[PDB]
């Protein structure tokens, strides 16, 4: 979620393989059934979520091309969707992707203190990933539960 283009990485090359599991294929079939038969182009986001779940919480370029081929839509459309939506990690992340809310309510509640405490505990800076592939800090916008701030989210799943 840093660059608006493909980062030149040896571990994210076109040669990297990716194949959906049969459970993922069944889920894709269910999603297509939910969506209109002709409008298969609307299933990009569920497919990206399934790819993230299958992989280590990131969407490989090969996986994106596979999604485009399955949906019979240009790969450029999938690229645009992934780049536009920030919840899709286009590069590998750590075991714990901490997402600290930094909007005005959390800032008033003391989000900066929580961020400093997290940095001190994890021995890493905001945004930067820890040396070991264990922690990845990020600053995000309003996650919704402002009345309960300060707040964080892990793996885009647990608040």
């Amino acid at each position: 979620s840093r660059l608006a283009a493909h980062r030149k990485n040896d571990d994210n090359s076109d040669s990297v393989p990716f194949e959906f599991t049969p459970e993922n294929y069944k889920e894709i079939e269910k999603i297509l059934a939910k969506y209109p038969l002709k409008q298969k182009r609307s299933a990009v986001m569920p497919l990206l979520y399934l790819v993230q779940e299958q992989n280590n919480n990131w969407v490989p370029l090969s996986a994106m091309k596979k999604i485009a081929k399955l949906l019979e839509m240009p790969e450029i459309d999938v690229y645009e969707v992934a780049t536009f939506y920030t919840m899709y990690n286009r590069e590998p992340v750590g075991k714990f992707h901490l997402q600290i809310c930094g909007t005005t309510p959390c800032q008033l509640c003391g989000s900066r203190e929580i961020t400093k405490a997290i940095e001190e505990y994890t021995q890493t800076k905001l945004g930067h990933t820890s040396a070991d592939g264990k922690w990845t800090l990020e600053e995000v916008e309003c996650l919704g539960a402002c009345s309960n701030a300060p707040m964080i989210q892990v793996n885009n799943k647990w608040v």
Binding site: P36, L37, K38, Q39
Partner: protein
């Protein structure tokens, strides 16, 4: 660049619109007399901004070309030359020029020898007459100038975009029923 229809109905205006039909004078023309007759019969009878068929008119070295000033002892090639009359539109590179074009008829002359001199590589033109194009408000004025100066003229009529219906709603269109075949 377009006066109201039949706004001018003068004899001079009608003569300017009309083009003369050639008379075979040279030996080659007499030999090709049938070709001259065919060309006279086929070429458009009158020239108007609403025309659509291009044509080439031979120079009329007649008493009408008495107003030319480019027939001098030193230079005797300017008169009788063939020009091109067309509307120069804005380049495709840009759509809103600071100085828009296409509002006037351009008269152009084919350029003669153009050579780069050895001492400095600077460009030189064998003739200085065809360096700058001429501009006229109306094709009638351009043709009148050509007749007065004794220059022959090819005329190429302009082409413009065909008007098409434009609406932002066309971006969103319902493809149809899925079962449709």
């Amino acid at each position: 660049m377009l006066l109201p229809k039949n706004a001018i109905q003068s004899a001079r205006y009608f003569e300017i619109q009309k083009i003369p039909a050639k008379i075979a004078k040279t030996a080659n023309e007499k030999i090709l007399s049938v070709g001259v007759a065919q060309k006279n019969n086929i070429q458009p009878k009158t020239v108007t901004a609403q025309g659509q068929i291009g044509f080439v008119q031979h120079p009329q070295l007649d008493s009408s070309c008495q107003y030319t000033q480019f027939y001098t002892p030193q230079r005797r090639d300017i008169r009788g030359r063939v020009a091109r009359i067309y509307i120069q539109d804005t380049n495709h590179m840009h759509d809103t020029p600071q100085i828009p074009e296409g509002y006037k008829w351009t008269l152009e002359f084919e350029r003669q020898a153009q050579y780069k001199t050895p001492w400095m590589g600077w460009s030189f033109n064998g003739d200085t007459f065809s360096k700058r194009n001429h501009y006229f408000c109306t094709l009638e004025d351009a043709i009148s100038y050509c007749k007065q100066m004794g220059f022959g003229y090819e005329v190429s009529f302009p082409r413009s975009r065909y008007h098409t219906r434009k609406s932002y709603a066309d971006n969103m269109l319902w493809p149809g029923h899925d079962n449709a075949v």
